[PDB]
Amino acid sequence: DQLFETVNKMKDSLQKIHKSLANFNVKIIERKNRPMSPDDYDQFLKAIFSNKLTIVKDNGNQIQKLVKEVLDAVKADKKQNSWKNYNDYVNVIVIEGISTAIQTALLHLNEQINPVFIKRNDISPLFDIRLELGQSGIQFDPEIGESSNQLTVRNTIRNWINDFFNIAGTIQRLDTTMPGDFLQEIRSFFEIKQCLAMITQNLEWIENECNQFRARFDTYSYLWTEDEQISFNRFLD
């Protein structure tokens, strides 16, 4: 019994962890029928990110409490090399689980973001772009670039991408120091790199064909806003 109990109490904790890890990943982003806007999607998804991030922490709080119930079960010292060995083994399952949970949603972006899937299906656009006429160049709210300034489709998708790495913090580590993060380990995993690198490739595809799409109008139309009235007078007579 006593042994059979300690075995199960431990096993029970691991299965519950696995179940908790599956339950929190769900679908990082959801898309609402028709298009809205870059800032409007940022506003919409902020409410869902806040709810999704908390559900991970709550699940993380349970998992952390379930680890203590394995010590109370087994009745073994934290100092002894055995329980340390396992204490690392448990965190790795949470690491791998986090890796998969982060990947699943990054793949859910990859389906919505990659042009060859959205084309084959009758799936609508998703972001909005405003276009204002500028004398010194063509002005877009998203600028159609990385920028690193104001608000851009990349800088928003950058802030989105981040929100899944931010999931590392909510767990706050299962061993050694209390203030530790997992963000380092999640970014060494090869599986996630590939998923992250696939998203960026798809972002550089659209930009080039959008640079060809915009160019069409630019050809005859940029030139006239650059030229002055006096130059127009000089050209005439």
| DSSP label of 150 | S
Farthest CA pair distance, the chain: 106
Closest CA to 194 of 77, 122, 125, 99: 99
d(CA 29, CA 20): 19
Token couple for 132: 């204002």
Residue 124 buriedness (CB in 10 A; 0-12 / 13-18 / 19+): exposed
| DSSP label of 33 | S
Q: Resolution to 1 decimal, in Å?
A: 4.0
